[PDB]
Design a protein around this ligand. Structure first.
Ligand SMILES: *[C@H]1C(=O)N(CC)C(=O)[C@@H]1c1cccc(CN)c1
Lengths: 167, 455
């Protein structure tokens, strides 16, 4: 049996966080996504030669069900804490998301990654340096991604698999 | 035989089909044998919405539910008025065109107007000038076949502007007696009635949500409070009940009394399972899997195995991306209360994960398959909203749950941290010894059970 990694995307709503996982799972030249099918959240990948299966939980659109976060979060081994570079409040929300994850996994060292997503051509309010600084304070990587170009998407997820493996 | 239609210079809807203006899916309309449109220009979509060869109710139903993402109500009305206003081409030719093109097309635009006014009246409630223009247009419509439909549209407009089973089971009571609202609490009300009255509220809240609140992922955007108020009331009730269940648990500091509380909630879950209230089932499951409750190992140890197993199967409904939940929802028949969260995610990801436009030979075409895909989810939401529950409303129990406010004046983080700090207090983190706490309930803890008291 190949290793299966249960990954959880957490982040503010209303800022296109769903693009991160949609872009990973859909083929780089296909734009025909159906969230209903099983293949829509499962992907077989090769990271540093070791083949694995990534199972990604993204509850995008269920943010108002705030009492379900703990439940959803406990499913995961690794977390992508996602904010939008065009929205400072989504960047300010990361601290509490991380605190919630630490509490759910009952651990100060949970495989985690900070992802800054460029969802549209709107102006950047979060400078890379501010996010690079926040990530260093938590002791985790920082990956920026673009929803239009698929740039950084694979590095965000692969970097998390390596955080789980090196735990 | 081939019919002579006017020129596109005078009438846009006569432009012939091509790869640059209309494309189709490989399969054919279920139940009807009609081609499935994948994408097209707005003019081609309006043409097919009011097609002369045949009537297309599914496309009409889909269109009027999802068109606002690519066309404004005001712009659509103009387009359907343009469609109706058919010029004759520049006899055998003119008499057949009148019966095989003008009459069928004019008749189909009137069906659109009727379906619009009947099922998406909100477009007119929010734009009085849109209703002036509709009523104005409908006034200009004259003909033999029209009078019937023109009068039906007028009778729907004025109605919209104005604004059933056998005997249900006996209301169950436990310690709290009817009218004694002051004593009502988790353990004093009957677990069957808590679950029934919560199922009625949650069923009404579920039924009140319209597709206008869902299409376009509007509940996630800045105006969510204006555009999705029933969905939000619904999600907030659910959140309230989850937090109340947790509060009941962690504020019951005595272990034996806390074991009675967790057991009673699992009984409420068991009745929600019986009633097919999956929202209710997941409210309990979410409270049990919350950070403050999950960690209470001394409490779950003393829970009977029947109740552990009940909670375990309910938890498994949520596993593997709601695999068992999805299967169980398809296997049951109404009345039921679905869990809305899945629908919300699927609509969001459909709309965010697919293009608004497809480009063929450099020309932009509206992606209608994306829209159809969303109308399929909203249609499924509506199929479970038809059937009501044959359960009697108890107005005081109803009001008790409607008015719950476990958070009080506290903010989420404040309250969440308090619930967690109560969990650590009542059951410290090892190797801290387990303290003892006094009892808080003067009344008996023994449950009356989840089986009715009378036939
Ligand atoms: C992403 C973002 O940060 N904001 C708020 C300033 C947006 O409106 C952007 C967004 C949101 C939802 C979907 C999409 C995809 N075009 C983009």
């Amino acid at each position: 049996h190949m290793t299966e990694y249960k990954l959880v995307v957490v982040g503010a709503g209303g800022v296109g966080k769903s693009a991160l996982t949609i872009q990973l799972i859909q083929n780089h030249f296909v734009d025909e996504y159906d969230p209903t099918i099983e293949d829509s959240y499962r992907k077989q990948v090769v990271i540093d030669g070791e083949t694995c299966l990534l199972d990604i939980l993204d509850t995008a659109g269920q943010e108002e069900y705030s009492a379900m976060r703990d439940q959803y979060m406990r499913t995961g081994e690794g977390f992508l804490c996602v904010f939008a570079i065009n929205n400072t409040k989504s960047f300010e929300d990361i601290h509490q998301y991380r605190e919630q994850i630490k509490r759910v996994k009952d651990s100060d060292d949970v495989p985690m990654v900070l992802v800054g997503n460029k969802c549209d051509l709107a102006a950047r309010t979060v400078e890379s340096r501010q996010a690079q600084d926040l990530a260093r304070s938590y002791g985790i990587p920082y990956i920026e991604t673009s929803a239009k170009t698929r740039q950084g998407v694979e590095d965000a997820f692969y970097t998390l698999v390596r955080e789980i493996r090196q735990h | 035989e081939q019919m002579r239609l006017p020129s596109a210079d005078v009438y846009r809807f006569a432009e012939p089909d091509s790869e640059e203006n209309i494309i189709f899916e490989e399969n054919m309309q279920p139940k009807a044998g009609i081609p499935i449109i994948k994408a097209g220009t707005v003019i081609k979509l309006i043409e097919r919405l009011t097609y002369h060869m045949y009537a297309d109710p599914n496309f009409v139903r889909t269109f009027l539910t999802t068109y606002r993402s690519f066309c404004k109500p005001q712009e659509l009305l103009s387009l359907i008025i343009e469609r109706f206003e058919i010029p004759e081409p520049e006899s055998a030719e003119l008499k057949r065109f009148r019966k095989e093109y003008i009459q069928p097309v004019q008749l189909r635009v009137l069906n659109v107007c009727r379906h619009w006014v009947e099922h998406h009246f909100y477009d007119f409630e929010r734009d009085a000038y849109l209703l002036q223009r509709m009523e104005e247009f409908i006034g200009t419509v004259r003909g033999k076949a029209m009078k019937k439909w023109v009068e039906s549209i007028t009778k729907i407009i004025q109605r919209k502007k104005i604004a059933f089973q056998s005997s249900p089971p006996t209301v169950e009571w436990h310690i709290s007696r009817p009218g004694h609202i002051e004593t009502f609490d988790l353990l004093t009300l009957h677990p069957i009635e808590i679950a029934r009255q919560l199922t009625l509220l949650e069923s009404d809240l579920y039924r009140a949500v319209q597709p206008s609140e869902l299409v376009g992922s509007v509940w996630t955007k800045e105006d969510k409070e204006i555009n999705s108020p029933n969905l939000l009331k619904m999600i907030r009730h659910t959140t309230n009940l989850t937090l109340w269940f947790e509060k009941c648990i962690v504020e019951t500091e005595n272990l034996e009394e806390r074991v009675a509380v967790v057991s009673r909630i699992i009984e409420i879950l068991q009745v929600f399972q019986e009633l097919n209230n999956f929202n209710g089932v997941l409210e309990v499951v979410s409270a049990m899997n919350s950070s403050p409750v999950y960690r209470l190992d001394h409490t779950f140890e003393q829970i009977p195995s029947r109740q552990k197993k009940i909670l375990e199967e309910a938890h498994e409904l949520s596993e593997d991306h709601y695999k068992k939940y999805l299967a169980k929802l398809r296997s049951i028949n109404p009345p039921c209360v679905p869990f809305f969260g899945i629908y919300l995610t699927n609509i969001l990801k459909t709309e965010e994960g697919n293009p608004e436009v497809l480009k063929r030979h450099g020309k932009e075409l509206i992606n209608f398959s994306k829209r159809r895909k969303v109308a399929e989810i909203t249609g499924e939401i509506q199929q479970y909203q038809n059937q009501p529950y044959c359960l009697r409303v108890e107005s005081d129990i109803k009001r008790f749950f409607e008015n719950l406010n476990p958070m009080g004046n506290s903010m989420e983080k404040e309250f969440t941290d308090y619930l967690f700090n109560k969990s650590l207090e009542i059951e410290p983190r090892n190797p801290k010894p387990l303290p003892r706490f006094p009892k808080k309930y003067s009344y008996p803890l023994k449950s009356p059970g989840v089986r009715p008291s009378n036939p």
